[PDB]
């Protein structure tokens, strides 16, 4: 007994805190590359010249189907940037849908703080909308091309399994990847995958901030960001509340700032002393919301520790932002997330693979009643 999308299950790999990547095959004859999956941008780009952190790269002169667009392109990220040259070529995903498309591809020739020593990936796949593509919104993103050229339904889903692997189901949903029900939140606007957060609780206790603060100046779902990032005022109140909740134990100020690690002897981490965190999201019906809840297993990330060692070290993976809330891997690793582009909504369900213990599990629950949710969005 196996689902229809079985061949797409377990098609993602990664190293903790270094993103998740899928194999993609480009050009003719085939050149296969590992590509980071990033719902927080809209450019498909691949290393195309030697670099000290690259084991392989795209060789355009060897691809008979490569077409030069005669146009440079530059993409800056929160951290990192690259410059390159636009072209098109044939692209397939071996463990994805059974189609081949002609896609825009940025050949990366120069970069700064983009590639990572020993990450195993060589490019990036921007899965968000045309509005944020560089150089402009006329450069059709990969997923747009896929839907326009083929029968593949305008939907994909992600199950990121923390410690690294997971699944990207393209064109559908695999029911073995989650338990319980899927709850949907509207995509507020098609640029980033923007959503509306209406309330935050720490161990069941409301942070009690104006919901406008949670979404100043946007809230997005972003698989290419490790952390849960919060606007400054929200970050400060959250840290205050998490500290109060974990007060049976003391940690230095720098731990909460991500500047200091704390390590426990292997297999002794007191998960139970840290609180759970809940975000409520706008639902699909007027005045209705639902909440997703994550565990410290999601927001305290282990730092390898690759070789067998006596010490489990952790970094606090909630951090501050000047560009709104980013629901990164810290959030996504608890859940199966459905990017339902066709119906302009994002679904969440408890992930079948999320890391938890015998006393607590990540959760998705509803419905709740929340009034005036429309006012929460930044304009």
């Amino acid at each position: 007994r196996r689902g229809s999308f079985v061949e797409m299950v377990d098609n993602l790999r990664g190293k903790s805190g270094q993103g998740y990547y899928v194999e993609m095959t480009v050009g003719s004859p085939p050149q296969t590359l590992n590509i980071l999956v990033d719902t927080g941008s809209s450019n498909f780009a691949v290393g195309a010249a030697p670099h000290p952190f690259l084991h392989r790269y795209y060789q355009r002169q060897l691809s008979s189907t490569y077409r030069d667009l005669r146009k440079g392109v530059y993409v800056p990220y929160t951290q990192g940037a690259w410059a390159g040259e636009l072209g098109t070529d044939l692209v397939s995903i071996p463990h994805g849908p059974n189609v081949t498309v002609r896609a825009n591809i940025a050949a990366i020739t120069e970069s700064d703080k983009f590639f990572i020593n020993g990450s195993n990936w060589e490019g990036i796949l921007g899965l968000a909308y045309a509005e944020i593509a560089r150089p402009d919104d006329s450069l059709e993103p990969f997923f747009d091309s896929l839907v326009k050229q083929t029968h593949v339904p305008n939907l994909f889903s992600l199950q990121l399994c923390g410690a690294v692997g997971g699944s990207m189901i393209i064109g559908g949903i695999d029911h073995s990847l989650y338990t319980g029900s899927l709850w949907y939140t509207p995509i507020r606007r098609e640029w980033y995958y923007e959503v509306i957060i209406v309330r935050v609780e720490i161990n069941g206790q409301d942070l009690k901030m104006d919901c406008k603060e949670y979404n100043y100046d946007k809230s997005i779902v972003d698989s290419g960001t490790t952390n849960l990032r919060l606007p400054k005022k929200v970050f400060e109140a959250a840290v205050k509340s998490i500290k109060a909740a974990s007060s049976t134990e003391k940690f230095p100020d720098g731990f909460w700032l991500g500047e200091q690690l704390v390590c426990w002897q292997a297999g002794t981490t007191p998960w139970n002393i840290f609180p759970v965190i809940s975000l409520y999201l706008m639902g699909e019906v007027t005045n209705q919301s639902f909440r997703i809840t994550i565990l410290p297993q999601q927001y305290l990330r282990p730092v390898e520790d690759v070789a067998t060692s006596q010490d489990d070290c952790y970094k606090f993976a909630i951090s501050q932002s000047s560009t709104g809330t980013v629901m990164g891997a810290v959030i996504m690793e608890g859940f199966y997330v459905v990017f339902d582009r066709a119906r302009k909504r994002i679904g969440f369900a408890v992930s079948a693979c999320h890391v938890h213990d015998e006393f607590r599990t990540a959760a998705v629950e509803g419905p709740f009643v929340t009034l005036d949710m429309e006012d929460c969005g930044y304009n």
Partner: peptide
Amino acid sequence: XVQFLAXP
């Protein structure tokens, strides 16, 4: 960690 798009 990674920190993927900025408005610069």
